[PDB]
Amino acid sequence: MNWIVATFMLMFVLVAFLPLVVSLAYTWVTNP
Amino acid sequence: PTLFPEITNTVRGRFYIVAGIISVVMAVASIAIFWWIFYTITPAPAPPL
Amino acid sequence: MAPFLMAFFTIVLIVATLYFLSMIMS
Amino acid sequence: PIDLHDEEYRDGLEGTIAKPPGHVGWMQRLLGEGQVGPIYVGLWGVISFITFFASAFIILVDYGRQVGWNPIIYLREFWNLAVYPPPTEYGLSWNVPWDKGGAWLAATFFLHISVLTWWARLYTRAKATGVGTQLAWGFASALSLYFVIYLFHPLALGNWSAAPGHGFRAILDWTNYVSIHWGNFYYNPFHMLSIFFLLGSTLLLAMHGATIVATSKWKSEMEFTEMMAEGPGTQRAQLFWRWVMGWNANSYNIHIWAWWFAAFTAITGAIGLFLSGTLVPDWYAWGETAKIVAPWPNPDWAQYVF
Amino acid sequence: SPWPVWSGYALCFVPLAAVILGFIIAARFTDKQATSAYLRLDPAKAN
Amino acid sequence: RALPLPSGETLPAEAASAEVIPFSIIEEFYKRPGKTLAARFFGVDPFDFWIGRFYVGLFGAISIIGIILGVAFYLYEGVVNEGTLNILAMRIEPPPVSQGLNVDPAQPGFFWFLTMVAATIAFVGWLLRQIDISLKLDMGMEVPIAFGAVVSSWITLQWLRPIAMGAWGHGFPLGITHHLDWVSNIGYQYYNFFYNPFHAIGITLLFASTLFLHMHGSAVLSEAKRNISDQNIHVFWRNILGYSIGEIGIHRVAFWTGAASVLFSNLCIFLSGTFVKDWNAFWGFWDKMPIWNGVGQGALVA
Amino acid sequence: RPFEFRTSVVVSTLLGLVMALLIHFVVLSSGAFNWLRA
Amino acid sequence: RPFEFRTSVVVSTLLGLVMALLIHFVVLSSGAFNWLRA
Amino acid sequence: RPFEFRTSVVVSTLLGLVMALLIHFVVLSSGAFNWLRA
Amino acid sequence: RPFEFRTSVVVSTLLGLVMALLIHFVVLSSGAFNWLRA
Amino acid sequence: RPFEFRTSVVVSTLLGLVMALLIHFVVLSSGAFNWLRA
Amino acid sequence: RPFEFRTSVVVSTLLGLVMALLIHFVVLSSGAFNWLRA
Amino acid sequence: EFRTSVVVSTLLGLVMALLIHFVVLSSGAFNWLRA
Amino acid sequence: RPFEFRTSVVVSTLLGLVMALLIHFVVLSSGAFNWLRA
Amino acid sequence: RPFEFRTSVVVSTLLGLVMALLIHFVVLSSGAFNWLRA
Amino acid sequence: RPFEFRTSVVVSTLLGLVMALLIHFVVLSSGAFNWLRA
Amino acid sequence: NDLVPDQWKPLFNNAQWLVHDIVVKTIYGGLIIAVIAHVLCWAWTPWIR
Amino acid sequence: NDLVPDQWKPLFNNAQWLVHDIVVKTIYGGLIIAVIAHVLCWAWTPWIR
Amino acid sequence: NDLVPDQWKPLFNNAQWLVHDIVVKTIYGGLIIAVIAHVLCWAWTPWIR
Amino acid sequence: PASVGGYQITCATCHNGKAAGLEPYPIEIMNTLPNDWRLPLELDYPGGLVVTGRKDVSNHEVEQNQFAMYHMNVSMGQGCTFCHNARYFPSYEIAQKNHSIIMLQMT
Ligand code: BCL
Ligand code: BCL
Ligand code: BCL
Ligand code: BCL
Ligand code: BCL
Ligand code: BCL
Ligand code: BCL
Ligand SMILES: CC(C)=CCC/C(C)=C/C=C/C(C)=C/C=C/C(C)=C/C=C/C=C(C)/C=C/C=C(C)/C=C/C1=C(C)C(=O)CCC1(C)C
Ligand SMILES: CC(C)=CCC/C(C)=C/C=C/C(C)=C/C=C/C(C)=C/C=C/C=C(C)/C=C/C=C(C)/C=C/C1=C(C)C(=O)CCC1(C)C
Ligand SMILES: CC(C)=CCC/C(C)=C/C=C/C(C)=C/C=C/C(C)=C/C=C/C=C(C)/C=C/C=C(C)/C=C/C1=C(C)C(=O)CCC1(C)C
Ligand SMILES: [Fe+3]
């Protein structure tokens, strides 16, 4: 439980990153 | 008999169901099989002296 | 009985999936 | 009366260099402008550049002296190398050996000149290109904090050791040591004000950038035009913030908010740092007499122990 | 004895009062200006 | 006619398509009901009205439930249960780490759990309501993205890290001046959180956020009420620093730096709890990377 | 009309629900009743 | 319509589901019943 | 008219509710009454 | 025509999936069933 | 002209001032002279 | 007209109120008077 | 997009392979590289 | 105007003030002169 | 054209220089050869 | 022309200077020569 | 607004009057139930003591 | 709205009346089931004690 | 605004007057209840002592 | 106190299986400290590393204090709040700070 649950929560922190990354990729793709 | 003809009739939309299913099971199998391997090969933390 | 039940519920998941995907893939 | 081409493409001192402007390309795709453009060299940029170069050169060759002149130990310890101010003994004196704070005093003096002449450059180029001098005064607030850290708080404490040690790890160490020496900076109330203004700075920056990028389709980003007549993007921005939180700003007010939140960050920080050493030696002890410290009779310390 | 020190008060509470009050007043005037009538592009046309 | 401008300047009309329009007109033109997230999902937004200036959606009502209940639970735990009467000395503490992840109404720390759950409901409802209102105004989803960065910073501190640690007492107490005690004790437990690299990145982006905010407020205020060709600020920003990011670029960088600061920050506190116990010990590998192990003598060896 | 009837209904119903939840939680946490093992 | 039937249905159903979940979670966390090993 | 009647109603009602809650909380936390197991 | 059949299907299916996931996770975390470890 | 006289003057004067300060700083910190109680 | 009269009134009234509060709090915290329990 | 699925699958496979190799090597279970 | 007189005045005055402050600071901190009770 | 020749030249030359420096460092720090008093 | 001659000159000269400095510093710090009291 | 009494015609629509009647009757029923619940909880455990 | 009684014609559409009837009958069935569940849980373990 | 007395006609609409009457009567009832509650709480436990 | 335990110092306490070549301050525990740094046993320890609000010390003494405190962090892996309430370091809340005073006097 320690490492499985810990890594699932880690992946949620990185998921939180994800939206901003989508914003940057949006800017790049839509500015061609 | 469907309400999402653009999702269940068209090959591109019909394919999206299989794509989503396969991606969900691929991610779940990824995580589950990793943690299985890790917990079976990793030794138990050495018993306290 | 837990391994029995987990296998049972995964096969019910799979058979459900074959059934309704068969309908969608009709 | 202001030639925008002449201010960009004059030559020499009181002119620009790198005048054939390059294009970065990815900066144009991601940020919308990729021209590096010419950069001005105007007798204040020169003082700034050469005094900063003197400062950095002193610091770097003292890093070299500290690693026994070994350029690998240099690269390995570069981030924990630092040129520390003179120790507490002989604290304000400048007759300190070069290795024990002698290099720090010279480098810090040249850095002072560099930041002051950079302020002068900001001011003179704002006047030369026709814009207001708001950036020079914002830098002056930042410099108020800076000169408290390096000049005014070491003085009035009696020792140069109160100042940071010119290093990648030394500034973090300095912040730790100063909060530890004066109790707990969390109970420094002007530190709390400055954190209010810093986190409100980041909150307003994020909100402003996000609002303008969201209303970007209707050219909300052209603030100069929007301040003459508010277009549909600025209207949508105002309505978004009115419906979200019941009040809004226009194209002009929001930048007043921005400027003042950042300036207050710097100013309240300077005040709190100057107060910590000279007037209130202990912030937690002061916080108990101020009744702002929560009683903690029986803390659960299992959380904080491994 | 129940009373914080003069120092405590000055420092924490009148800056607390100033920040709260001043923020509220600045917001009041921010929105008076923002909701006043000035040159906008008519929405029916420009949009 | 005087022709009042958005800045507050009255310019005498000759010395554009603009007309002096009342805000009430702007506000009523842009109402457009029924575009919200709830109206896509259910076919209708249950609350599609405005209460005063505020838009009340489905997620606005959820958010206001969360707000009222969170404020009332906060003040119950700290006026009652603590008896303090002054908000600077009250101590809204989670259940003890002894209790683990389970919650008990009889045990202390129950009203912290309720305040945290209602505050999470309030914050997520605020985020979803921002999505509502951006959908109503045909805007981009950037404001919800930034607020989601900070809401995920809250989720990390009160949900993800306490769950991963497994004790629910690893959430920070909800006390003015006392959550600072938690921040200090967590910062020193994993000693030198300054050496935490995601923490250093977070501080770098916080300082850069305040710097960009000052520079942008300066730039827009400096060209505000002057006869300027809109290229004066660009020339100024190329004379200083030899680069002008442009109008759309400074707002993009604003949004991005703002969000990224707290994103790297929540990565820092989460790692600080679960994977790294000591942030000085973390950097033990650096002097042993094999490219500079061997070269040193005395204190100059490592 | 000073107050839309729908607005008053929403506000009153939400206030009543929030107050019922708050009072239930205060009474249950008080341990004064011996309800749900109190 | 101020009072659409669809709106009342959505609100009532969501309120009922939220309240059922809340009450289940309060009762399960209370440990007052011995349900699911309590 | 200096004040909309709706504004005065909202302000007075919210002030009264906030004050009732505050006074109830202060009186209950004082332990001066022996109400809800003192 | 109110209540499109498509809408009811989407809402019911999503509610059922969310509830199945929630109940599975609550039951697995309770350790009454011990994440199937037995 | 390729070189402006004002530029050379600024550069030379600033270099001379920086070098005078640096050399004074180095000589005073060396403690080799007994100047200002060394 | 160097100053609007309304501005001077606001500033003077706010300064007087702030100073009255500050002086009252300084005098009460000094414990020099025996006012409100010494 | 097929390119998106390819990128995601390839990156997941590489990350998985690295993770499993590192877990197996650190376990000291197999006699690999003097373990 | 290769050199503006105002520029030279500003630079010379600022240099003189900075140097006076620096020299005063250095002489005071040296403790070589017994100033203000050393 | 997939690759400008200048780009490939820059990348290859920088990679070669970085690798030469890295390998020299690694070999010198290993102390496995008596190079430079090792 | 793949490479401006000025660019190659700048890069080569800077690389040579950096490498000369690096090698001098490595050799002097090695203490392998007895140069400058090593 | 025909169904509304003319006293309350400035305030209540025709449909709002029926929903108001439902709300009033629900509030009254809830009040009776609340009074009964309070009397029962007092007979069980007085909270004022 | 012909299927709707005239008393509720200002409020209920023709289709909304049938869905309301379904909702009412579902609420009644759920109430009966909830009463049965509460009686069973009380006979099992009284929560008021 | 006919129902409003001419003294308060500059301030009160026709509908605002009825809602004001409701608010006034509610405030009066709440005041009577508050006085009764205070007398009861004083007879129970005097807080001034 | 007995709450610590009744553990007593013996041979293996300091030798840990090595007769000679005992190295206090190995390079493992000198990670971010200066390698030359040693515990300052010169000072009178019930108050030797005290730094808070002193006004006769500055960041140099705070740095020495922090070197000693991180040495204690490594020596007992429980980190910095093992014997401190980090909101006030001068406080003796945790009672491992008193044991540490006894141990500083002992070393
Ligand atoms: C075990 C005893 C516990 C307790 C545990 C619970 C639990 C557990 C629950 C309640 C719920 C309720 N309890 Mg209780 N309750 C207790 C003590 C009390 C006391 C009292 C003072 O003692 C009171 C007054 C109540 C009052 C109530 C009501 C709020 C509610 C039941 C009626 C209701 O409105 O919803 C009636 C419910 C319906 C009308 C919903 C009908 C839904 C239909 C039947 C569908 C059901 C879902 C179905 C499986 C989906 C199938 C779909 C497929 C596609 C076909 N409880 C004690 C402490 N109580 C229930 C509730 O719903 O909360 C809102 C519930 O969840
Ligand atoms: C005490 C002996 C110390 C030492 C301490 C110093 C100090 C101290 C200084 C030098 C400086 C210099 N030394 Mg030495 N120097 C030593 C050993 C050496 C040795 C040697 C191998 O031994 C050498 C070659 C040098 C070489 C030099 C030159 C680099 C320079 C002097 C000439 C020069 O170019 O500037 C000539 C200077 C001028 C042309 C400037 C003229 C400026 C005018 C006169 C204004 C002066 C300021 C005036 C007060 C302002 C008034 C303005 C009012 C408005 C009217 N030193 C020994 C170790 N050396 C001086 C220098 O300037 O460094 C650049 C200096 O500051
Ligand atoms: C706090 C500031 C208040 C205010 C408070 C007062 C007061 C109070 C008075 C006036 C009065 C005046 N004010 Mg006014 N006034 C305000 C705003 C304004 C503004 C504005 C810009 O709009 C203006 C233009 C004015 C203008 C004026 C004139 C109409 C008038 C005559 C002043 C004069 O001749 O001074 C000349 C006189 C002096 C400057 C004397 C200076 C006094 C010094 C301080 C010595 C005082 C000795 C002290 C009493 C003894 C102390 C002993 C202790 C008891 C131990 N006021 C603001 C709002 N104003 C005066 C008035 O109208 O008379 C009926 C007066 O009484
Ligand atoms: C107990 C003695 C304490 C002390 C405690 C206080 C306190 C406490 C106060 C002062 C205040 C003042 N003291 Mg002192 N003071 C002391 C020693 C001194 C000494 C001296 C050298 O010894 C001096 C010169 C002063 C000087 C002063 C003045 C600054 C001021 C009184 C006149 C003034 O300008 O405001 C005159 C005030 C007015 C003109 C305001 C008029 C406001 C009107 C009357 C409304 C009042 C509020 C009212 C209740 C609101 C009702 C509204 C309803 C809607 C109807 N103090 C000693 C140490 N001092 C008073 C002050 O106001 O500070 C600004 C004050 O608060
Ligand atoms: C006590 C002896 C200390 C020492 C302490 C100081 C101090 C202290 C100072 C100097 C300063 C200087 N010293 Mg010394 N100095 C020492 C040893 C030396 C030695 C030597 C090798 O021994 C030398 C060459 C110097 C050389 C110098 C020059 C750099 C300078 C004096 C002339 C100058 O240019 O400015 C001439 C100054 C002027 C032309 C400024 C004129 C300004 C006018 C008069 C206004 C003055 C301010 C006035 C109060 C403002 C009033 C305004 C009101 C509105 C009316 N010092 C010893 C160690 N030295 C002085 C200096 O200014 O540094 C730049 C100074 O501050
Ligand atoms: C002492 C033996 C050490 C060792 C130490 C080194 C060192 C030291 C180096 C290498 C480098 C290399 N080693 Mg080895 N190497 C060892 C064991 C191995 C083993 C093996 C399994 O055992 C292998 C396969 C290799 C493989 C290699 C290649 C990666 C490379 C040499 C060819 C190459 O591509 O660059 C060929 C290089 C060139 C084509 C560059 C040509 C550059 C021209 C000639 C300019 C040279 C600079 C010149 C002075 C500048 C003058 C400019 C003036 C303006 C005129 N090494 C052992 C452990 N190895 C060399 C390398 O370059 O790494 C990239 C190097 O630096
Ligand atoms: C003491 C012996 C030390 C050592 C110490 C040094 C030192 C010290 C240096 C080198 C440098 C070099 N060494 Mg070695 N070197 C050693 C062992 C080796 C070994 C070997 C395997 O053993 C090898 C292959 C090398 C290889 C090399 C080359 C990389 C280089 C010399 C040629 C070159 O390209 O630059 C040729 C250099 C030039 C073409 C530059 C010409 C510049 C002109 C002449 C100007 C010179 C500056 C002048 C003073 C400025 C005057 C300007 C005025 C205005 C007039 N060294 C041993 C360990 N080595 C030299 C180097 O430059 O590194 C890049 C250098 O600095
Ligand atoms: C210890 C603690 C914490 C105690 C807490 C004490 C408190 C405060 C308790 C609070 C209780 C409250 C307020 C409970 C609330 C109960 C409600 C509102 C239930 C709603 C039922 C709504 C129901 C069943 C709705 C059913 C909806 C149905 C059947 C919808 C059906 C449907 C509709 C209409 C369609 O589209 C088409 C057909 C379809 C079937 C899909
Ligand atoms: C220990 C310490 C610190 C002690 C502190 C001591 C202090 C300082 C105490 C301060 C007390 C104060 C200031 C109390 C305030 C009491 C108030 C304002 C009560 C308001 C009642 C508002 C009321 C009744 C409002 C009623 C509103 C109603 C009835 C709404 C009516 C309606 C409106 C408007 C509609 O459209 C339609 C619906 C309906 C008709 C119901
Ligand atoms: C722990 C350990 C030991 C790990 C190690 C194990 C591994 C992974 C080793 C890795 C080995 C690798 C990857 C080696 C790679 C070597 C390369 C890329 C060399 C590049 C040469 C590039 C060269 C020579 C480029 C030369 C460029 C030249 C001559 C430029 C010429 C010129 C250019 C371009 C001009 O404008 C004009 C003409 C001019 C001649 C001036
Ligand atoms: Fe802007």
Side-chain angles (χ1 to χ4, degrees), chain G residues 17 21 24 35, chain H residues 9 12-13 15-16 19 26, chain J residues 3, chain R residues 19 23 26-27:
Chain G
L17 170 75
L21 283 167
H24 271 94
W35 154 41
Chain H
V9 175
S12 51
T13 299
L15 174 55
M19 286 309 310
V26 165
Chain J
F3 293 101
Chain R
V19 195
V23 172
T26 290
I27 282 175

